[PDB]
């Protein structure tokens, strides 16, 4: 027997960051972020709410991933990409992003759910295996 408050507590228990964005032409603005996201990025909610997530790329917007994200956005399809993001203080991390389009039954708008998994250690370790191999 599960209720809504419990769903929220599941989303809050999440290690991976979790966000919800709505599409506004070429921008996709944030309408929801969980605590994990804040700890992963260093930004608080009101700092980043209602903006497009590109600010996490910082002065790095020449990634291959971006194009494929936009394509998947248009086709209303889920995708997973690895990008380089930068925290509020400027620290670098490797972000495995998953965007799942879901269509809200309330209005019939499509919202996008993002799951950010920090994979910096995987990156550095397979890189190091590459150097040792």
Ligand X SMILES: Cc1cc2nc3c(=O)[nH]c(=O)nc-3n(C[C@H](O)[C@H](O)[C@H](O)COP(=O)(O)O)c2cc1C
For residues 82 and 87, give the distance between their C-alpha atoms in angstroms, rounded to a whole number.
Answer: 16
Interface residue with ligand X, options 33, 43, 48, 85 (CB under 6 A): 85
The rounded distance, in Å, linking the Cα atoms of 106 and 6 is: 21
Q: Which burial class, exposed, middle or buried, applies to 111 when counting CB atoms under 10 A from its CB (0-12, 13-18, 19+)?
A: middle
Cβ-based nearer residue to a second copy, 62 or 129: 129
Instruction: Determine if residue 15 is labeled as part of a ligand binding site.
Output: no
3-state DSSP assignment of residue 26: coil
| Backbone φ, ψ for residue 80 (5° rounding) | -135, 125
Other C-beta atoms lying within 10 Å of the C-beta of residue 95: 23
Instruction: State both tokens at 131.
Output: 């150097």
Instruction: Pick the stretch among 14-22, 51-59, 65-73, 85-93 that binds a second copy (CB under 8 A).
Output: 14-22
Is residue 95 annotated as involved in ligand binding? yes
Is residue 34 a known part of a binding site?
no
CB of 69 to a second copy, least distance (A): 16
Structure-token pair, residue 27: 């921008």
The whole-angstrom separation of Cα 8 and Cα 80 is 24
**Residue span binding ligand X (CB under 6 A) among the ranges 7-15, 42-50, 94-102, 119-127:** 94-102
Q: Residues in the site for ligand X, rule: CB under 6 A?
A: 19, 21, 26, 28, 52-54, 56-57, 62, 66, 69-70, 83, 85, 95, 97, 99, 112-114, 116
Which residues contribute to the site for a second copy (CB under 8 A)?
Answer: 1-11, 13-16, 18, 20, 31-32, 34, 98, 100, 102, 104-106, 111, 113, 115, 117, 121-122, 125-126, 128-129, 132-133
Q: Which residues are annotated as a binding site for FMN?
A: 52-54, 57, 61, 66, 70, 85, 95, 116
């Amino acid at each position: 027997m599960i209720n809504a408050q419990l769903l929220q507590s599941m989303v809050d228990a999440s290690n991976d960051g979790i966000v919800v964005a709505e599409k506004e032409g070429d921008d996709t603005i944030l309408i929801y972020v969980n605590a994990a996201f804040e700890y992963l990025t260093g930004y608080s909610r009101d700092e980043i709410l209602y903006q497009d997530c590109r600010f996490l790329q910082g002065d790095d917007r020449d990634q291959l991933g971006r194009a494929r994200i936009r394509k998947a956005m248009a086709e209303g399809r889920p995708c997973r990409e690895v990008l380089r993001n930068y925290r509020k203080d400027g620290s670098a991390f490797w972000n495995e992003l998953s965007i799942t389009p879901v269509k809200s039954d309330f209005d019939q708008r499509t919202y996008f759910i993002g799951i950010q998994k920090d994979v910096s250690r995987q990156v550095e370790l397979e890189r190091e295996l590459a150097e040792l191999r």
